[PDB]
């Protein structure tokens, strides 16, 4: 579990875990507000 | 109004490009059957369009000649939003990145190798780094003050 | 050490002893090898196999008694679906702050054992509770039954435990037979009573 | 002191000898003793300012309610018109604040250095504490004892959350703080924030 532990915690594992969940984030808000131009909220 | 433009709910132009998009759409529409799938996804997309363009005369932006909308960085109090809002939010959010990395970078600093912590992450650290910049102008601030900031 | 195991004539781990109740030498796949993992995976298991004992009973007495004709309680699948006195929402902002409140003072006991034994309004009032996920006292063992010998106490502790795993597996089997079949688990144990051999998850 | 969350030590740097002290610092703000003097002073005025602020924003709606002064709300307060113009009052306020706060300044900046009267020099105000001036600020002759340090820390970190409730829950809603908490005593399970939308 250690040794596991310390290669899921390896560079570019953590990148690419980092990137989808940014990524998916990101197309989930783009889903929820379909498209946007200007900050309408003020 | 600025610039010779004109607002984007009076210019016909915008009206006139609605048109063509959808005709556009409807005239690949008419080829699949009424109870398709194809069709309500076209269907969908005319929905989306229109919402999209009266959202875009609701906002007051101002198209041109072209009939495209235009974007004012004057700092003119009418047009905040299109850029001064969303440069705040940026410099907000590339401020907490830029002090958590420097403050990962200074925390691992200490160790007798930091080479292997930084191709090898240790997460309790970063994760307990990550949140404090949430308050990173303060910390900021506060450091410039006492002189911390700029190396020696 | 002489204790049976899951699979007779292999070798148990050796991170897993036996002191711990419930203890049959099974995980093939290392996940407790850390000390703090065990103490984590424990505390799981007993909170999972109490909470699955109390669904897996709100389960299948009320659907028994619905069978006879003493109860009119709807199907558990659609309970959520009907209309009640507030708006959903609110009875789970309601509940997420109640439970909140004594899951964070659980976790406070979990990560140091000994610092919520006290109420905290009334200096008076204590938990006589000495065992992590065991809090004891007046209010979580009013009746005495839990402090007593060691046997006693671990016979008690290997008791609950496989009561709650065959509850977790009586709430999963519950929930995939009415998402397959479309009927009530009474039901679907009665037509399997009725035709043992045709009336099977082959049909 | 106390603890804010049980289970959880509290800050090397927080020692308790400062009133109002629980130890509640998650995010590393007063690593430094020169932050956390000029935190604490910062934190004393926001919220000596929050206490008023909010006895302003709320008597007179209660008293109005009662039906035996007509004033207007707090959001409103600004439309209606004055013996003077606006600008006018902004600028005397600037010339006077200006002042007040550069005096406190200096105060803070050096401890004991403002304390005498520029104009009758027979008049100083007597040697204490940064942020408790006492004397001709202290008429009743009140002793500052750790207590009522204590429960004023109290009252303005509440009144601070009062003011920031009272901003949020009139810009969610058009009404003002009276009504809406008439509106959800009049039907507590269909009037809450998770009600609306
Ligand atoms: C850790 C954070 C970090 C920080 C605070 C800085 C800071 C700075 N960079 Mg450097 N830089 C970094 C990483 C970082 N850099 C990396 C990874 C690279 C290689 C791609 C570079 C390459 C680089 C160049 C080529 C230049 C700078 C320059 C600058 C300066 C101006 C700002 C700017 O122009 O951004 C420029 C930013 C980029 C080109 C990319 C950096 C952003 C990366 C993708 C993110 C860093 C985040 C990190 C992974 C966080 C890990 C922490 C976590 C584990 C907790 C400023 C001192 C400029 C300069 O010299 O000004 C005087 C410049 O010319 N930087
Ligand atoms: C619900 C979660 C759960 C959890 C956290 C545990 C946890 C534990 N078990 Mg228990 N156990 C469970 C349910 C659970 N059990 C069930 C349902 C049974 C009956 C089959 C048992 C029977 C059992 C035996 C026979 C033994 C243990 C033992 C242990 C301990 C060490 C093994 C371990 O590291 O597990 C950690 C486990 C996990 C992190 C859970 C998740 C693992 C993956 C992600 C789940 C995959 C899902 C599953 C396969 C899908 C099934 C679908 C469903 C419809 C059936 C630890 C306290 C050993 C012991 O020492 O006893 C004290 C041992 O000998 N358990
Ligand atoms: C482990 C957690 C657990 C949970 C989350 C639930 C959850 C629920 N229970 Mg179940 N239940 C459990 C364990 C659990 N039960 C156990 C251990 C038993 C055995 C005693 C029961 C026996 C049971 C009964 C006999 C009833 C429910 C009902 C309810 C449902 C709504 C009522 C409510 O929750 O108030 C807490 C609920 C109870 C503990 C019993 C009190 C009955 C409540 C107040 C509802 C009475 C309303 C009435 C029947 C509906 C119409 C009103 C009328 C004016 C028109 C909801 C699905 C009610 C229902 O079926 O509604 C759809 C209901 O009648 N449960
Ligand atoms: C299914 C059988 C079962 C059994 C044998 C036990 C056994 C035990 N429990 Mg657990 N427990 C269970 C289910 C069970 N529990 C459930 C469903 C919950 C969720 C409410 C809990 C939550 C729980 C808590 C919060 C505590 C215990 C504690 C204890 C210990 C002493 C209390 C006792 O008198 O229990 C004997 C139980 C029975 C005789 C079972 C029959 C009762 C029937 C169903 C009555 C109908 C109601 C003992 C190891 C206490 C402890 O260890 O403190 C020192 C403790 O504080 N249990
Ligand atoms: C926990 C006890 C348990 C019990 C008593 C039952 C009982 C029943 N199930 Mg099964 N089932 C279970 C677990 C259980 N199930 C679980 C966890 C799942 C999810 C994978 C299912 C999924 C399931 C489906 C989808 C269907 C049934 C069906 C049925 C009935 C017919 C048997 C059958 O065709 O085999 C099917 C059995 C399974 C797919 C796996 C069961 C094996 C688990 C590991 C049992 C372990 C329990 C224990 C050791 C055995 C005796 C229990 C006793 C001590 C009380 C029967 C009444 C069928 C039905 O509707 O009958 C008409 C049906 O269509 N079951
Ligand atoms: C902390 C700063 C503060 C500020 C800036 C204001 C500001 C204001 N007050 Mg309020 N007020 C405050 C605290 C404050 N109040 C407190 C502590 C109380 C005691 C409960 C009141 C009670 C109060 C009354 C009774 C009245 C005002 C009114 C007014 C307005 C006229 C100003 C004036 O004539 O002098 C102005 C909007 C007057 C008004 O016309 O309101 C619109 C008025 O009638 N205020
Ligand atoms: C009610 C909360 C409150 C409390 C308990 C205190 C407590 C204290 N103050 Mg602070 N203070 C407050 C609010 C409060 N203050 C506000 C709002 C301001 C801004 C005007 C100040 C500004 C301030 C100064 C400038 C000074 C103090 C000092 C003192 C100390 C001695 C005086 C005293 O005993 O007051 C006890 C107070 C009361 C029993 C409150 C009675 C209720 C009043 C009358 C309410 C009227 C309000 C109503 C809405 C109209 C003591 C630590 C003095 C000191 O430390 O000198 C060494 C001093 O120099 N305070
Ligand atoms: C300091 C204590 C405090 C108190 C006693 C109240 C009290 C009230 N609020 Mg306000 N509120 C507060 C602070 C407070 N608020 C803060 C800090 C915010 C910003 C997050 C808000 C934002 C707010 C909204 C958006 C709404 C209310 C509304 C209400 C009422 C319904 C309560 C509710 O639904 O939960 C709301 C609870 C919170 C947002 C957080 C908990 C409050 C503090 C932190 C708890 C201690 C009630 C009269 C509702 C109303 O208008 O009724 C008609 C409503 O819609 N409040
Ligand atoms: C001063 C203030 C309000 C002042 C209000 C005034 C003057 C109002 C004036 C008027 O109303 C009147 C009287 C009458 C009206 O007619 C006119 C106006 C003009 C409208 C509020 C401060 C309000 C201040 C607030 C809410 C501050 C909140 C701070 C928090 C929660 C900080 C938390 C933490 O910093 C800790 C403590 C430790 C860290 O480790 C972690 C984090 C989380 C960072
Ligand atoms: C908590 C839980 C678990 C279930 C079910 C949980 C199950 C089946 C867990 C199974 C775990 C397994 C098999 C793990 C196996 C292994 O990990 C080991 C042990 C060791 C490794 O070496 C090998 C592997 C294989 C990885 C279930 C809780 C259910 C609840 C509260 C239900 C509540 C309700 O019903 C009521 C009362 C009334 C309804 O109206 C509403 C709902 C809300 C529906």
């Known amino acids: 579990m250690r040794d596991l532990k310390t290669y899921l915690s390896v560079a570019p594992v953590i990148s690419t875990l980092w990137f989808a969940a940014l990524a998916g984030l990101l197309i989930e808000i783009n889903r929820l507000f379909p498209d946007a131009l200007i900050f309408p909220f003020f | 109004d600025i610039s010779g433009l004109t607002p984007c709910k009076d210019s016909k132009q915008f009206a006139k490009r609605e048109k063509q998009q959808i005709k556009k759409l409807e005239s690949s529409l008419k080829l699949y059957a009424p109870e398709s799938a194809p069709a309500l996804a076209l269907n969908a997309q005319i929905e989306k369009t229109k919402r999209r363009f009266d959202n875009y005369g609701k906002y007051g932006l101002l198209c041109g000649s072209d009939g495209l909308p235009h974007l004012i960085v004057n700092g003119d109090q009418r047009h905040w939003g299109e850029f001064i809002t969303p440069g705040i939010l940026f410099l907000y959010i590339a401020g907490w990145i830029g002090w958590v990395g420097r403050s990962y970078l200074i925390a691992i600093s200490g160790e007798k190798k930091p080479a292997m912590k930084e191709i090898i992450i240790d997460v309790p650290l970063a994760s307990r780094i990550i949140f404090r910049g949430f308050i990173w102008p303060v910390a900021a601030y506060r450091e410039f003050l006492n002189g911390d900031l700029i190396a020696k | 050490p002489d204790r049976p195991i899951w699979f007779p004539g292999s070798t148990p781990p050796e991170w897993l002893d036996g002191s711990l109740p419930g203890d049959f030498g099974f995980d093939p796949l290392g996940l407790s090898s850390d000390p703090d993992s065990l103490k984590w995976n424990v505390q799981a298991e007993i909170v999972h196999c109490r909470w699955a004992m109390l669904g897996a009973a709100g389960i299948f007495i009320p659907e028994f008694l619905t069978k006879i004709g003493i109860l009119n309680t709807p199907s558990w699948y659609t309970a959520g679906e009907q209309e009640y006195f507030t708006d959903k929402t609110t009875l789970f902002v309601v509940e997420l702050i109640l439970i909140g409140w004594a899951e964070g003072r659980r976790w406070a006991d979990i990560i140091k054992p000994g610092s919520v034994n006290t109420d905290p309004v009334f200096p008076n009032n204590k938990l006589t509770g000495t065992d992590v996920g065991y809090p004891g006292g007046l209010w979580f063992d009013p009746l005495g039954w839990g402090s007593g010998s060691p046997a006693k106490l671990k016979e008690l502790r290997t008791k609950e435990i496989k009561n709650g795993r065959l509850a977790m597996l009586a709430v999963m ?22 035709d043992p051999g045709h009336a099977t998850i082959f049909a | 002191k106390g603890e804010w969350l049980p289970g959880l030590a509290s800050p090397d740097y927080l020692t308790g000898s400062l009133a109002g002290d629980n130890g509640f610092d998650p995010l590393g703000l007063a690593e430094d003793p020169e932050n956390l003097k000029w935190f604490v002073q910062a934190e004393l005025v926001n919220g000596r300012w929050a206490m008023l602020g909010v006895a302003g924003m709320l008597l007179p709606e209660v008293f109005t309610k009662i039906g035996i002064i007509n004033v207007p709300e707090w959001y409103d307060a600004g439309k209606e018109q004055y013996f003077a113009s606006s600008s006018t009052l902004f600028v005397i306020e600037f010339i006077l604040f200006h002042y007040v706060e550069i005096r406190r300044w200096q105060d803070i900046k050096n401890p004991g250095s403002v304390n005498q009267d520029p104009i009758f020099k027979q008049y100083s105000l007597p040697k204490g504490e940064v942020g408790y001036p006492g004397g001709i600020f202290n008429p009743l002759n009140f002793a500052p004892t750790q207590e ?11 009144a601070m959350l009062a003011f920031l409730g009272f901003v949020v829950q009139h810009n969610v809603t058009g009404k003002g703080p009276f009504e809406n908490l008439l509106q959800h005593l009049s039907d507590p399970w269909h009037n809450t924030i998770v009600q609306t939308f």
């Open chain 3, 173 to 194: 089997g519950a929930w995939f037979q009415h998402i397959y079949t479309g009927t009530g688990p009474i039901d679907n144990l009665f037509a399997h009573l009725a």
């Open chain 4, 148 to 158: 009522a340090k204590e429960k004023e820390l109290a009252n303005g970190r509440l």
